Amino acid sequence: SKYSQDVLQLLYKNKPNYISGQSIAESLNISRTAVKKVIDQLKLEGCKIDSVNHKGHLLQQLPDIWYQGIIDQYTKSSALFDFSEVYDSIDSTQLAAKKSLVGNQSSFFILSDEQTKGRGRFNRHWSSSKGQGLWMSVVLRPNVAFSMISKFNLFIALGIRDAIQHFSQDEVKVKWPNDIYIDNGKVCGFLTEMVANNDGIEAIICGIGINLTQQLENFDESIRHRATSIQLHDKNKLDRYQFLERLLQEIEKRYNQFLTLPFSEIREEYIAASNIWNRTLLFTENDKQFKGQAIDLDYDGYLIVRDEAGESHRLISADIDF
């Protein structure tokens, strides 16, 4: 109700310390027995809080639900982002981000527990089941030319990857240009779009879907061989909030690199992180489809491909299948 996030904010702010019902009640100028009432609900909503008499409450562990209130804490103390929007369900964070950026120069991100109408590249359906993954759009505001998009996409990839890795027992690879894998399962897909004109980019909108807490059971049967989740590669439970934290951390890192360094500078690294070498790839281009091999990513972000018929292409993007 009206005060839930508020209570939550305090519980989060105050860690690893207990706070009294009383104390909360005076912050939010409401009754002591209201606070007891707002707590019990959170607990029922799958919050783990320790209540100790004469001592008060301690927010121990959070459920697989995004709470605005907590997110605000991430936003408050952040160079990069002005604010955030958090939903339990929406059509698409990317759609919402696309609307929210109009007419303003803010930087912000959107998060939703479920997306009812999530879309990937080429307007593909992207499956965004409730409480199971991170579905986020990020808006940043680099002052640069529109051509510079592709570079963003490459830098940001390593960002996302590092974040995922740091929680994975196994090797986490990028599949240029838009996809992250753990061994054989796609664990994430992301996409970098812009509003821009000739004078430069007005905004970057970076959509990111990462499967967090799935069982193969939860994955569709017709894709269950090539999909995975972060949880399936961490012996420890996966705290979405801990993970969101590291995700923003590396986004920032890579965002700054994108601004201050040329692609040549991360190219090697990108390379070692990629999983497309030494195997045969099925490219699509509209009606046409063909196989070929990944020769090299050039100093400019372009992939050097040698098609099955021996011809070299230099490509800025492509959709590749294994």
Distance in Å, CB of 306 to a copy of itself, minimum? 21
As a whole number of angstroms, the longest Cα–Cα distance in the chain is 77
User: Among the candidate windows 21-29, 63-71, 143-151, 161-169, which touches a copy of itself by CB under 8 A?
Assistant: 143-151
CA–CA distance, 199 with 203 (Å, rounded to integer): 12
Among ligand 36F, a copy of itself, none, the one that 209 touches (CB under a kind-dependent 5 to 8 A) is ligand 36F
Buried b (16+ CB within 10 A) or exposed e, 78-94: eebbeebbbbeebebbb
If one asks whether residue 47 binds ligand 36F (CB under 6 A), the answer comes out as no
CA–CA distance, 322 with 320 (Å, rounded to integer): 7
Distance in Å, CB of 128 to ligand 36F, minimum? 6
Nearer to ligand 36F, 11 or 111 (CB): 111
Which residue's Cβ has the minimum distance to ligand 36F?
Answer: 120
The only residue of 98, 161, 233, 254 in contact with a copy of itself, by rule CB under 8 A = 98
User: Among the candidate windows 54-62, 164-172, 189-197, 285-293, which touches ligand 36F by CB under 6 A?
Assistant: 189-197
The only residue of 13, 36, 119, 141 in contact with ligand 36F, by rule CB under 6 A = 119
If one asks whether residue 189 binds a copy of itself (CB under 8 A), the answer comes out as no
If one asks whether residue 120 binds ligand 36F (CB under 6 A), the answer comes out as yes
Distance in Å, CB of 202 to ligand 36F, minimum? 13
If one asks whether residue 93 binds ligand 36F (CB under 6 A), the answer comes out as yes
Buried b (16+ CB within 10 A) or exposed e, 167-194: bbeeebbbbbbbbbbbeebbbbbbbbbb
Cβ 123 vs Cβ 207: under 8 Å = no
Locate 217 and state its tokens: 């059971």
Distance in Å, CB of 228 to ligand 36F, minimum? 9
If one asks whether residue 63 binds ligand 36F (CB under 6 A), the answer comes out as no
Helix (H, G, I), strand (E, B) or coil at 32: helix
If one asks whether residue 288 binds a copy of itself (CB under 8 A), the answer comes out as no
- In 10 A of CB 7, how many CB atoms? 26
Helices (H), the chain: 4-13, 21-27, 32-44, 68-76, 93-100, 149-165, 240-260, 264-273
Residues that bind ligand 36F (CB under 6 A): 92-94, 115, 118-121, 124, 126-128, 135-137, 178-179, 186, 189-191, 207-209, 223, 227
